[PDB]
Design an enzyme around this catalytic site. Structure first.
Site, short mmCIF file in Angstrom:
data_model
loop_
_atom_site.label_atom_id
_atom_site.label_comp_id
_atom_site.label_asym_id
_atom_site.label_seq_id
_atom_site.Cartn_x
_atom_site.Cartn_y
_atom_site.Cartn_z
N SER A 49 3.85 31.86 -32.35
CA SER A 49 4.82 31.36 -33.33
C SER A 49 4.96 32.24 -34.56
CB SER A 49 4.40 29.95 -33.75
OG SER A 49 3.01 29.90 -34.00
N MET A 50 3.86 32.49 -35.27
CA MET A 50 3.95 33.32 -36.46
C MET A 50 4.06 34.79 -36.08
SD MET A 50 4.10 32.15 -39.57
CE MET A 50 5.33 33.20 -40.32
N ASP B 100 6.62 24.09 -27.34
CA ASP B 100 6.14 25.42 -27.00
C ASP B 100 6.99 26.02 -25.89
OD1 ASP B 100 4.30 24.47 -28.75
OD2 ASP B 100 2.55 24.80 -27.47
N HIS C 104 7.00 28.14 -31.32
CA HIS C 104 6.93 26.70 -31.47
C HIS C 104 7.26 26.36 -32.91
CE1 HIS C 104 3.13 26.85 -33.64
NE2 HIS C 104 2.56 27.50 -32.65
N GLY D 68 -0.91 31.72 -36.90
CA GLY D 68 -1.72 31.24 -37.99
C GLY D 68 -0.98 30.51 -39.09
#
Ligand SMILES: Nc1ncnc2c1ncn2[C@@H]1O[C@H](COP(=O)(O)OP(=O)(O)O)[C@@H](O)[C@H]1O
Ligand SMILES: Nc1ncnc2c1ncn2[C@@H]1O[C@H](COP(=O)(O)OP(=O)(O)O)[C@@H](O)[C@H]1O
Lengths: 338, 191, 166, 192, 111, 99, 56, 56, 44
Positions: D96-97, D170, D121, D67
């Site tokens: 990612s987060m 990614d 990513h 997010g």
């Protein structure tokens, strides 16, 4: 009746690390004994009893301070527990029984028994059965107590000995663990969860000692104590904590020290007993882990010497025995000298 | 679904939501786009805490990409109006309106996390209608711009001229940059 | 003053009997309600005693019995029922005996309403059996019959919250 | 809906929520798209647990697709600020987060399920407007990219150059591959 | 009054009091009149289940059922002079009038 | 009726068993005179109202102020009288001693 | 047991205590203290007068 | 064992029993040992309305 | 029983001071005394 300074001196030999509380107890107990010394009270003005309130952690020396005073000035001493009275049924019979127990040590003498020093512990627990406080405050007010003389199969109603508790000193000890938070909220910043809030609970416990000294009636009512009960306990003495260094001192410095007691038992056996400085901290470390304060010290040393006590009599020509930190840990066996 | 926490005291046990439990500790959570409704809620919390104790400090966690200017002024004026010092802590970010409230905190009680991003810009507005009405609204928003810059200069300590050039366009700032700029006092790296 | 005058009416030249009038001291805590009772025992010639209503409970329960009040009054009277009948009594913390809010009565309140029901006949005057000394009510043949008709009662309590009602 | 549960304590029976009950045991659930609103809720949970017992560890369960960076970065700073160690467990997936928070956990306490998928990513964003504004926003996101890569390298232990190349696109990492990369420490295959 | 086997006073104590007025004369007491005040107090608290034993209440009523109609009550022989050779006096209450009285608070709501 | 601040001051001195007389008597039998000034009396009543202890609290407030002197007064010699002032009530100032 | 029971956690990394290895009379009475004996009904003074404790 | 003055027993009789074993010799009697079995049975209990008094 | 309370309040002041008062032979109670506006008339 020794002077307040003299009372503190005697208390210092038996107890240590509670100098501030000793002063409060010394001056307060001195005034009560002085009131008893001046019990005639020829003048119309009648002096009022000053009941002490001990607030300290477990195993901090609250009970020891009670009997130590009685040993100095011979007077009957009795102990009681608030938890026993939590039932809240026929509380009158239980409280008068405390006087009956005191009379057993006072040769069933009303005059001598009135001068006794009563001690109570675990007062925080009753705070919230509320009913026990309603009845308990009457005891501190001072009321006649009908007690049968030296038991007896049966006796007339009038025969029952009557003792007035107005002249008896009551010490309602307790350990208010959660009160420190209430005081910090009133004195320190209200915030306790935010980033800025002081949540540095390092567990050092040094700050709590000063914090408890600022105890006021406002924090007590928050804890659940009724205002009427608080008023009858004007004098308040606070014990901060027993330090690890102090625990080492308690092991040997007091007159009837634990090391001296064991040394005496070993001395008559014919073998000298020695404790290294490293060994003393080991006992303190084990005691602090238990969290029972000085109470744990007796069990730790007893277990350490359990094995040698069993086998040392069988051993012959043992000139001396020595103990080190490893021995307290149990990994090693104490040194034997021949 | 907000979780429920139990507070244990000698009197008894009480159940509170996570936000209400922290409110007892004088902690207000400013989050999302600023608006009249959310701002009114924050104002109610400030007055309530002022009544409980007008001496203890109040903490305000700011995480918001700005919002309505009028709603923000209500919060700013309320903080200065009440006696308690309102501390401001920037979590995540603090845009134009969030930054104005952040720097508006009591001197020496303005904090920001190390990875927080602070952005400041001039007010945004628009009006549709007759030319005469446009002149009225254009003057109003310009007065607001000068007023906000003056207030920001006062708290930050920067000159009004410096604040004007910097706030003409979006100026993203970091926690260390904010300290030297004057928006914040110190960074809360660790406990 | 009226209490002593009633004792003076023992001659009973006229058949009319001087009924007693009990007092109800309602005041905040720390206002000297208990002090007033203690300051009267000094001058009072007749036996005077103090008790607590919270300890008292309905009969047939482990808490206490209202008859024990007379036992305390007998201690000062040297267990002489003749003079004890002309004594005075003080009952503290009567506020706690009040009925709880919207009670269906299925709870069978012992600490509250039960205590009031037993005191009714006691205050107005009735022979009340009293154990000889520190004993529970039981088939024991020995019981002291003390009449409370002439024993004045002063009930003092701090009715917290009554101000809102008024 | 959420099923209520009963906790048996000496005080008496207590009706707790399924999530509230676990919160009492220092367990925080991070689920769904990371946003400002949910992040403040997690932050409040962390601060509350810190006050109760700063010594005991905290367990953060991460199952989310990622997010916002600003909202997620407020949780990272909170974890590092508080004294108690924050253990991170990956259930299902960690984007990612979610992966940044996973690797941000206390050294030696980060865990991952055997079938979980960890994807990392680079930050993505956009702006519309004049060229002057684009330069400002373009420089900002690039600084965030370097900032995030610097921290990710610190926890994983890999060099900044390797992280930069790997996170350019990614990259999906399985639970065992994550151990070698340094994102996590151990795999909780079965209770012992 | 309370049910048998509890701290409260037994129901039979009433007959003993009647004997005291009669100088412990069973014949005079057997033809005496008895009054029981506050009879409303010993009432079930509108709880037909009777989950708990109402010793002071319903228990007293149950015990009183046979006394009013007639029972061979037992009481101390003569002022409790001594426990040896009790020979508890036998008193038949078949001809003893009983007059109960009490203020039934709340009865209006029922009617 | 409830007590008032001025009433508490009266209770300190006017009653026959007044707290001031009791502490003075304790000092007098020891051989040292004691005197409570008007400024000290008013401060004591304010402390009770501040702590909401009430009339019963008077014993506690007086105990703290005289705690130090009572401990050291028997040990000390040639003390003709002790004086208490408003400053001593808060605790910042030491008790005035007369030889 | 009520005093020395740590409790069972719910999380993945917590330690679960099965009923098989919950506790036993052995190793439990050894940790007896005076406070627990008082709850049983023994007088505190009586316990203090008995320092030696032999637990089977 | 029961409270003194009751039909059950008196605690003081324990000393007399020890003398019978030692032929009432005060010297050797003081060196005797006592074993009070079932000590827990007399643990303190709450008051009972039906019971007259808690002798034990 | 309520009647006693009403009379006690009305005669509270007179009973308090009537014994100490001298040369008082009789006292009268009127409707005003019950209201409390006036004190009972004293006959000397
Ligand atoms: N300074 C000291 N010197 C010697 N013994 C001590 C000292 N402090 C504590 N103790 C020991 O610790 C024990 C604590 O007992 P007690 O006061 O009853 O515990 P608590 O205060 O937790 O109720 C005492 O029996 C005493 O022997
Ligand atoms: N006018 C007064 N003079 C002296 N002491 C007073 C006065 N009024 C109240 N007190 C104090 O109030 C206490 C008694 O009140 P208390 O027993 O608390 O009343 P209650 O228990 O009925 O609420 C006494 O210790 C007394 O010192």
């Amino acid at each position: 009746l020794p002077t307040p300074h003299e009372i503190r001196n005697h208390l210092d030999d038996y107890v240590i690390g509670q100098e501030q509380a000793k002063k409060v107890l010394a001056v307060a107990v001195y005034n009560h004994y002085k009131r008893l010394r001046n019990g005639d009270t020829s003048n119309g003005v009648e002096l009022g009893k000053s009941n002490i309130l001990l607030i300290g952690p477990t195993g901090s020396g609250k009970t020891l301070l009670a009997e130590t005073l009685a040993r100095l000035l011979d007077v009957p001493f009795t102990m009681a527990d608030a938890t026993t009275l939590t039932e809240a049924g026929y509380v009158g019979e239980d409280v008068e029984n405390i006087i009956q127990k005191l009379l057993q040590k006072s040769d069933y003498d009303v005059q001598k028994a009135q001068r006794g020093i009563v001690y109570i512990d675990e007062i925080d627990k009753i705070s919230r059965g509320e009913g026990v406080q309603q009845a308990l405050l009457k005891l501190i007010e001072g009321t006649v107590a009908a007690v049968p003389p030296q038991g007896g199969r049966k006796h007339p109603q009038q025969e029952f000995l009557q003792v007035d508790t107005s002249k008896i000193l009551f010490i309602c000890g307790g350990a208010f663990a959660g009160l420190d938070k209430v005081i910090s909220h009133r004195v320190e910043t209200g915030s306790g969860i935010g980033f800025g809030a002081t949540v540095k609970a390092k567990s050092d416990k040094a700050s709590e000692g000063e914090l408890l000294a600022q105890v006021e009636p406002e924090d007590l009512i928050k804890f659940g104590l009724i205002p009427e009960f608080i008023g009858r306990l004007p004098v308040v003495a606070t014990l901060n904590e027993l330090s690890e260094e102090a625990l080492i001192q308690i092991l040997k410095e007091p007159k009837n020290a634990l090391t001296k007691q064991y040394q005496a038992l070993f001395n008559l056996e014919g073998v000298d007993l020695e404790f290294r400085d490293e060994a003393l901290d080991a006992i303190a470390k084990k005691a602090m882990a238990r969290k029972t304060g000085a109470r744990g010290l007796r069990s730790i040393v007893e277990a350490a010497l359990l094995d040698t006590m069993y086998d040392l009599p069988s051993m012959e020509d043992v000139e001396k025995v020595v103990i080190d930190e490893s021995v307290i840990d149990g990994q090693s066996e104490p040194l034997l000298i021949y | 679904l907000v979780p429920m926490v139990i507070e244990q005291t000698s009197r008894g046990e009480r159940s509170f939501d996570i936000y209400s439990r922290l409110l007892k500790e004088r902690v207000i959570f400013l989050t999302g786009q600023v608006e009249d409704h959310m701002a009114n809620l924050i104002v109610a919390q400030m007055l309530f805490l002022e009544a409980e104790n007008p001496e203890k400090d109040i903490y305000l966690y700011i995480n918001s990409p700005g919002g309505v200017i009028t709603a923000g002024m209500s919060i700013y004026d309320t903080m200065q109006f009440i006696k308690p010092d309102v501390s401001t802590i920037c979590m995540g970010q603090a845009a134009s309106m969030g930054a104005f409230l952040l720097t508006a905190g009591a001197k020496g009680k303005r904090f920001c996390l190390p990875n927080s991003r602070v952005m400041i810009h001039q007010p945004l507005g628009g009006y549709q209608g007759q030319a005469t009405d446009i002149e009225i609204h254009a003057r109003e928003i310009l007065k607001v711009k000068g007023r906000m810059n003056e207030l920001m200069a006062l708290h930050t300590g920067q000159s009004l001229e410096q604040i004007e050039r910097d706030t003409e366009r979006d100026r993203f700032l970091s926690a260390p940059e904010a300290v030297e700029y004057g928006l914040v006092d110190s960074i809360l790296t660790h406990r | 003053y009226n209490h002593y005058k009633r004792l003076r009416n023992g001659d009973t030249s006229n058949g009319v009997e001087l009924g007693k009038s009990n007092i109800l001291l309602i005041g905040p805590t720390g206002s000297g309600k208990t002090l007033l009772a203690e300051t009267l025992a000094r001058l009072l010639d007749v036996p005077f005693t103090m008790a607590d209503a919270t300890t008292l409970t309905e009969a047939g329960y482990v808490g206490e019995d209202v008859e024990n009040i007379i036992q305390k009054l007998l201690q000062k009277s040297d267990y002489d029922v003749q003079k004890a009948q002309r004594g005075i009594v003080y009952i503290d913390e009567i506020d706690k005996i009040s009925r709880k809010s919207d009670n269906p009565s299925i709870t069978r309140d012992v600490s509250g309403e039960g205590v009031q029901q037993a005191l009714l006949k006691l205050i107005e005057g009735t022979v009340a059996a009293v154990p000889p000394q520190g004993g529970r009510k039981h088939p024991q043949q020995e019981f002291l019959q003390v009449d409370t008709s002439k024993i004045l009662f002063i009930c003092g309590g701090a009715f917290a919250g009554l101000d809102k009602v008024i």
